[PDB]
Amino acid sequence: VTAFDPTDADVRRDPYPSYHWLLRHDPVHRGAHRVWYVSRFADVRAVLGDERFARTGIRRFWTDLVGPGLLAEIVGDIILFQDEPDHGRLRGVVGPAFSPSALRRLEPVIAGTVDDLLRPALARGAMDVVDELAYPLALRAVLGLLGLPAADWGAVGRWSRDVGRTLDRGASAEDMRRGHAAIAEFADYVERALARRRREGGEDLLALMLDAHDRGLMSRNEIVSTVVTFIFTGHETVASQVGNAVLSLLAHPDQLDLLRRRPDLLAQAVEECLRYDPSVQSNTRQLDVDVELRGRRLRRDDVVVVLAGAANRDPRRYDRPDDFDIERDPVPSMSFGAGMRYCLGSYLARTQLRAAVAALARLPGLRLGCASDALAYQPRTMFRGLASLPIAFTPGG
Numbered sequence: 182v183t184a185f186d187p188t189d190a191d192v193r194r195d196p197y198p199s200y201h202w203l204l205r206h207d208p209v210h211r212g213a214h215r216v217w218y219v220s221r222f223a224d225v226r227a228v229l230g231d232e233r234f235a236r237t238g239i240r241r242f243w244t245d246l247v248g249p250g251l252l253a254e255i256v257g258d259i260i261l262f263q264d265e266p267d268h269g270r271l272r273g274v275v276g277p278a279f280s281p282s283a284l285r286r287l288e289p290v291i292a293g294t295v296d297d298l299l300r301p302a303l304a305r306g307a308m309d310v311v312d313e314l315a316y317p318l319a320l321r322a323v324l325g326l327l328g329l330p331a332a333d334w335g336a337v338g339r340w341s342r343d344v345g346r347t348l349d350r351g352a353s354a355e356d357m358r359r360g361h362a363a364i365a366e367f368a369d370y371v372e373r374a375l376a377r378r379r380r381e382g383g384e385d386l387l388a389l390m391l392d393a394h395d396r397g398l399m400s401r402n403e404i405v406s407t408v409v410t411f412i413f414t415g416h417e418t419v420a421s422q423v424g425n426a427v428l429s430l431l432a433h434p435d436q437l438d439l440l441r442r443r444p445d446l447l448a449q450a451v452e453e454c455l456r457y458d459p460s461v462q463s464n465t466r467q468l469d470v471d472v473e474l475r476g477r478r479l480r481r482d483d484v485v486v487v488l489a490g491a492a493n494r495d496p497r498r499y500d501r502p503d504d505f506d507i508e509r510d511p512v513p514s515m516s517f518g519a520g521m522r523y524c525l526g527s528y529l530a531r532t533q534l535r536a537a538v539a540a541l542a543r544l545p546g547l548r549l550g551c552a553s554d555a556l557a558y559q560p561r562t563m564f565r566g567l568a569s570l571p572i573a574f575t576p577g578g
């Protein structure tokens with residue numbers, strides 16, 4: 182692997198042989214376009230806990246790339262684009278809404294919505310897990326978190342993908358026009374939700390943000406941008422992970438049987454899915470100062486990508502790392518990051534993946550609806566996710 186490129190077609194559909202080489206021969210690697218790639222668990226964790234590997238250079242590049250106006254002003258304010266102290270401020274505001282305690286309200290909602298999504302599939306004995314389970318579930322869950330009407334999932338998912346794809350460095354004139362068009366409609370939506378809370382009340386996350394705005398801790402734009410942040414990152418990551426999880430279990434029929442026979446293994450089966458095929462393969466940073474790493478000299482202003490996908494396959498951390506083992510000891514992975522930017526939504530994620538996998542393993546005759554090889558990953562670099570995952574089972578469920 183002379184210069185690693187995640188945009189390469191081979192790497193898009195199975196990056197794991199590239200990773201194996203990387204963490205064995207070049208753990209801190211200068212890849213395509215002079216982007217550094219960090220592979221090993223120890224180093225990934227090192228980078229993520231270091232504020233010097235920052236997001237500000239990425240924000241400024243992106244806002245000047247999209248140009249002046251509503252899109253720049255709103256998406257410019259997103260938490261993913263901030264360093265301290267703005268990052269700490271926004272995280273302090275929304276943080277308490279994501280506690281396991283604060284999220285018990287959603288358990289029956291999420292279990293319930295998995296049921297409702299399975300429901301039209303049962304008599305058919307077939308389903309595309311991506312279209313019909315993964316995406317709606319993830320969108321309904323993050324809407325519930327916010328306190329927004331869960332029936333708006335489609336419209337809001339669309340706005341968020343149109344806006345979100347505008348951060349994808351491989352952009353289009355078409356993507357852009359749609360992004361600018363969707364941010365306007367999206368912003369209206371949120372303002373109408375805020376006004377409803379202004380006049381009616383609420384105890385939801387959107388209400389907690391509106392209150393933070395009143396105490397001057399958060400601007401109107403920051404509320405809108407936080408809403409956009411959660412919906413976009415909240416739904417694509419979870420949806421793709423539900424798909425990957427089901428694939429991981431279908432690919433390993435014996436592991437599926439074990440879980441089916443031993444339902445107590447659900448929690449760690451999910452952990453293993455997160456470990457083995459994470460929907461977020463990597464995260465980007467840009468250095469504010471020279472930093473030394475495994476003898477490599479990474480320069481001020483260099484772009485640095487940490488590979489959560491590779492770090493999860495690190496032999497220094499995991500015995501037989503390339504094997505899918507649901508009975509492995511649940512030892513924390515990199516799938517939710519570390520340090521300052523650790524995943525606020527990890528519990529919400531787990532609740533969804535547990536409910537989705539529980540309901541699907543419970544199905545007699547569960548199998549792939551197509552051939553193993555006909556599967557295809559989505560064209561974007563931002564997440565690892567299937568375009569389609571047809572499954573079949575015994576009609577009746």
Ligand code: HEM
Nearest residue numbers: 261411415418419422461464516517518522524525526530
């Ligand atoms: C399986 C699904 C998910 C995966 C694999 C995942 C993964 C990650 C990772 C790796 C990070 C660290 C980002 C970095 O270091 O640059 C992160 C951060 C974050 N995630 Fe998640 N996540 C998932 C689901 C969710 C959900 C459901 C939400 C709720 C809306 C959420 C909200 C956030 C937020 C707010 C951050 C903070 C980023 C920052 O402070 O810059 N995530 N996630």
